[model samples]
Target: KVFGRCELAAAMKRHGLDNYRGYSLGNWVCAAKFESNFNSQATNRNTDGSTDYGVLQINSRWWCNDGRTPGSRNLCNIPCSALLSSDITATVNCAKKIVSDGNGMNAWVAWRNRCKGTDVQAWIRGCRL
Candidate 1:
């Protein structure tokens, strides 16, 4: 369930976020790699019984209201959008927007390396704002 290039490109234009969306897939893949190794279908079963699922590792119950039961062990039985909420994607895309009004790849990679090295999580840092 990924959007193809053409459709994604069109959606990018339609949303007036083509610049960020154009770069989003790669950064998303990168985050997925660092976070869950690209496991779009993976979910963690916590001792407390809550779960974190999907590529972005979104907490289905918290963001989508589709998890087991607020600390229960159950798979979400809903579409990715319902579970993820488009706003999350948009928010993530905004990170890319800030990175590259024009130049970003090198800086983004450098930033990612630093954060990973220090175990500092979250794609966007406070200083980035």
Candidate 2:
């Protein structure tokens, strides 16, 4: 399911994404927009034969085990499919793990290229909390 901007923001906030690991909700909101366009079921094929899953696009190669990526780390210990849930609980949890691992928002290159050092508050400008 594709979430509206504010809806996605609210979900992220509810999952404790505000100022998570020193990054504001706007940074995550911006990342969600660029990574998966707020679609919970979003998935992309990486050139490395890995898959990026869900709204945050958690990767099969390192963060999640899709049962297909060779030598998967599965650090979140979650099935990649869990990230596709519209509830976004697993999505945010896995994302939290990614950020807490010292990668911060840089784990997703899209954030670096688009949201990094940008005016991310604009992402939540019209959203409530």
Candidate 3:
């Protein structure tokens, strides 16, 4: 599902992204913006044959099992297909795992390039969640 900015903020907050793992709401929202533009069904296949999926673009290289990645870790213990569903629950939960795994928000380069060290408040501003 394509989420409006406010809607995505609300959902992420509901799923525990707010102040999660020492990060703020704006951080998650900002990361989602660059990763998938809040499109839950987003997917990208890398030249290495790994896949990126869902709103935050969890990757097959370590996060999910697509059965084709050369040395998939499947750390999220979910099939890569779950990341394609419009429901963001699995995606969000999987991201929690990714963060808890010590990668922090750095798990997504989009977050680093676009959100890290930036004023992410713009990503959540004007949105009352």
Best by TM-score: 2
What lDDT does candidate 2 reach at residue 128?
A: 83
TM-score of every model? Answer: 0.38, 0.97, 0.94
What lDDT does each candidate get? 0.41, 0.91, 0.89
Error of 1 at 89 (Å): 7.6
What would the per-residue lDDT of candidate 2 be over residues 46-127, giving only the tens digit for each residue? 8899999998899999999898999999999989999999889988888888898876789999999999999999998888
Which 10 residues in a row give candidate 1 its minimum summed lDDT? 120-129
lDDT of 1 by residue, 11-85 (tens): 434545433534443344344455444444456655655555544454444333443546432233344344234
Query: Roughly what TM-score does model 1 have, to 2 decimal places?
Result: 0.38
Worst window of 10 by summed lDDT in candidate 2: 95-104
Q: 1 or 3: which has the higher lDDT?
A: 3
Assess candidate 3 and give its lDDT: 0.89
Q: Give per-residue CA lDDT, model 3, range 99-127, as digits (tens).
A: 88877989889999988999988888998
Off by over 4 Å in 2: none
List runs of model 3 lying over 4 Å from the truth: none
Residue 3 C-alpha lDDT in model 3: 85
Residue-level lDDT for 29 in candidate 2: 92
| Candidate scoring better on TM-score of 2 and 3 | 2
Instruction: Identify the leading candidate in terms of lDDT.
Output: 2
Q: Give every collision pair in model 2.
A: none
